[PDB]
A paper describes a structure:
A key regulatory step in the mevalonate pathway is the ATP-dependent phosphorylation of (R)-mevalonate to (R)-5-phosphomevalonate catalyzed by the enzyme mevalonate kinase (MK), a member of the galacto-/homoserine/mevalonate/phosphomevalonate (GHMP) kinase family. Distributed widely across eukaryotes, bacteria, and archaea, the mevalonate pathway consists of seven enzymes that convert three molecules of acetyl-CoA to isopentenyl pyrophosphate (IPP) and dimethylallyl pyrophosphate (DMAPP), the isomeric, five-carbon precursors to all steroids and isoprenoids. Each MK monomer consists of two domains, where the active site lies on a surface cleft at the interdomain interface. To shed greater light onto the mechanism of MK and to further investigate archaeal MK in particular, we determined the X-ray structures of MmMK bound with the substrate mevalonate and with the product 5-phosphomevalonate.
However, in both chains of the structure mevalonate makes very few direct contacts with the MmMK protein, in contrast with the several contacts between mevalonate and LmMK. However, many of the contacts observed in the LmMK structure are lost in our mevalonate-bound MmMK structure, where the only direct interaction remaining is between the mevalonate C3-hydroxyl group and His16 (MmMK numbering, corresponding to His25 of LmMK). In fact, the β-strand of LmMK that directly interacts with the mevalonate carboxylate is shortened considerably in MmMK such that there are no residues in this region that can reach mevalonate; in place of the LmMK residue Tyr167 that makes a hydrogen bond with mevalonate, MmMK contains Ile150, which is not capable of interacting with mevalonate. Instead of forming direct interactions with the protein, mevalonate bound to MmMK interacts with several ordered water molecules that themselves form hydrogen bonds to the protein. In this way, water molecules form a cage around the substrate to mediate bridging hydrogen bonding interactions with the protein, including with the backbone amide of Val18 as well as the side chains of Lys9, Ser135, and Asp138. Electron density also indicated that two conformations of mevalonate were present in chain B of the mevalonate-bound structure, and occupancy refinement in Phenix yielded occupancies of ~0.5 for both conformers. These two mevalonate conformations differ only in the position of the carboxylate group, which faces the solvent exterior, indicating that this moiety may “swing” into two different orientations at the protein surface. However, the prior mevalonate-bound LmMK structure as well as our mevalonate-bound MmMK structure presented here suggest that this aspartate residue may be too far from mevalonate to directly deprotonate the C5-hydroxyl, with distances of 5.2 and 5.5 Å, respectively.
Residue numbers in the entry:
A (entry chain A): 0 to 301
B (entry chain B): 1 to 301
């Protein structure tokens, strides 16, 4: 009676920060996944990298919210959930959405809730609102369904036959403060910054055709433009620049911040034959590197 | 023994976008080219590069300055000595300065009687002669000085700030960089042309911030301008390291000055944070020049 589910993380090819101002973005699930194993138990126990708890909204807020929410439809007396992940809690890789979706998947399987993927993505959205007070459905949608998806129209795009090199600066990045900083900048210089958001949106809409045609060189070129605009919005840091420039010099098609910035990770779109060379340059410049690829697979019952 | 000097300049905002009709703001800095002009036997010019006569290869600007000027007042012997504090490249203005200082030093030793605008026009056309083509910007800013808007040429109040210039020592072809931006603009005109508009809008806003002395906001707009230059593809790792080191050490702002691809960045700092910023830039590997803005254009020393 041992069930396991996994859900992937994601990167932004284009358009982070500008979505909340009405602009288009392109997200891409990657083959770094969070796994949740679930078992019948006498009590509620959650174990992850930060230890073992019961219901605990300081250490395990997403998993605990999932259990509380789902126990209202089919009562859950006890359960043992074990979480392990390749997604570092730290950047714009979607670690919160992955454990949320994987937790819902595991309990759906274990207790026979019979939820559809669409229902799961919607429930995962509700959980993140519960935990964060407000949240966009994007993270939990991409983790449920995988692949490449535009935001907010949710067009599904051809998954690139590409390497993806993620470089983690190890700097803790607080998404809400960076989002608030960008808002203050926009407020300070509205006629200047709002067109900058339009440009980021334009990049995503150009990028769509390039994703569909598989022009990874052109995609990387536009990723580099996008990186500049993100730098202009104030969310780049020295460590991110160094990883990004080191990836480019090693032959990446393009490299940029993914997610909120201010720390966290960058992403380098790389031909497969150049993944190691790119990864080595990024590690050499001080980055904790992960080599991965896009995935079409969202929530999976392992 | 006559002595004259003219300064270099940095861009506060607007490089790369002037050629697409947008506004820039330049700032003359207290880095100058001093030429001493005196009478001797033969036309002789001494610089760091060495001692020659009329030589349009080794001393192209000084020699072209002598060539044009003797046509209206004969010079048969000069002893022109040239020293400069101005680093080369990065649009810092070393050629414009050596030009203006020479014109004004020969005009002081000999006759001529030029006006300041007269000085600017001859310097600009001397650059035309030597480089083939040339913008009047560098020669005007070197002559009049202070803070100058481009192209409207309005003067603005000199900010009371430190100016840290960090040289990456990386060489870059300005013609090749300008062409790469032009190509990118042609590839994605609907995307890149609005970025050039944004650079101009920064200059329009920054003009008001210079007038009010809001150095903090000037720096913030410098940091936005730098992201746009990075988006246009003219940034590199060494420029970024210097720029972020200056910001973390308290600069109001830091950005590329000039064409990019290498060359120099500039940091605007409070006067009391200037050596702190300079030390951080040097520790990031930059070749640092510490300076400040200058009201003074061409000055008879
Ligand atoms: C920075 C942001 O745009 C994405 C962070 O991954 C925040 C958001 O869109 O909700
Ligand atoms: C890129 C550019 O605007 C700055 C070089 O000084 C080119 C020019 O002004 O001639
Ligand atoms: K959790
Ligand atoms: K120069």
């Amino acid at each position: 009676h041992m069930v396991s589910c996994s859900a992937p993380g994601k990167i932004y090819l284009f358009g982070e920060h500008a979505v909340v101002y009405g602009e288009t973005a392109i997200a891409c699930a990657v083959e770094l996944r969070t796994r949740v194993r679930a078992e019948l138990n006498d009590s509620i126990t959650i174990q992850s990298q930060i230890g073992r708890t019961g219901l605990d909204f300081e250490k395990h807020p997403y998993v605990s919210a999932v259990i509380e929410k789902m126990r209202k439809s089919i009562p859950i007396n006890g359960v043992f959930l074990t979480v392990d992940s390749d997604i570092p809690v730290g950047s714009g890789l979607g670690s919160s959405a992955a454990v949320t979706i994987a937790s819902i998947g595991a309990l759906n399987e274990l207790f026979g809730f019979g939820l559809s993927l669409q229902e799961i993505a919607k429930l995962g959205h509700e959980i993140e609102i519960k935990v964060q007070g407000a949240a966009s459905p994007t993270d939990t949608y991409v983790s449920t369904f995988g692949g490449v998806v535009t935001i907010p129209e949710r067009r599904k795009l051809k998954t690139p036959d590409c390497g993806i090199v993620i470089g983690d600066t190890g700097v803790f990045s607080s998404t809400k403060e960076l989002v608030a900083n960008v808002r203050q900048l926009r407020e300070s210089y509205p006629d200047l910054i709002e067109p900058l958001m339009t440009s980021i949106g334009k990049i995503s809409r150009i990028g769509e055709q390039l994703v569909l045609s598989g022009d990874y060189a052109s995609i990387g070129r536009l990723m580099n433009v996008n990186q500049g605009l993100l730098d202009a919005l104030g969310v780049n840091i020295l460590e991110l620049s160094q990883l990004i420039y080191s990836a480019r010099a090693a032959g990446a098609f393009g490299a940029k911040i993914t997610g909120a910035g201010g720390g966290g990770c960058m992403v380098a779109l790389t031909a497969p034959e150049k993944c190691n060379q790119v990864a080595e340059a990024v590690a050499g410049a001080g980055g904790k590197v992960t080599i991965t690829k896009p995935t079409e697979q969202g929530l999976k019952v392992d």
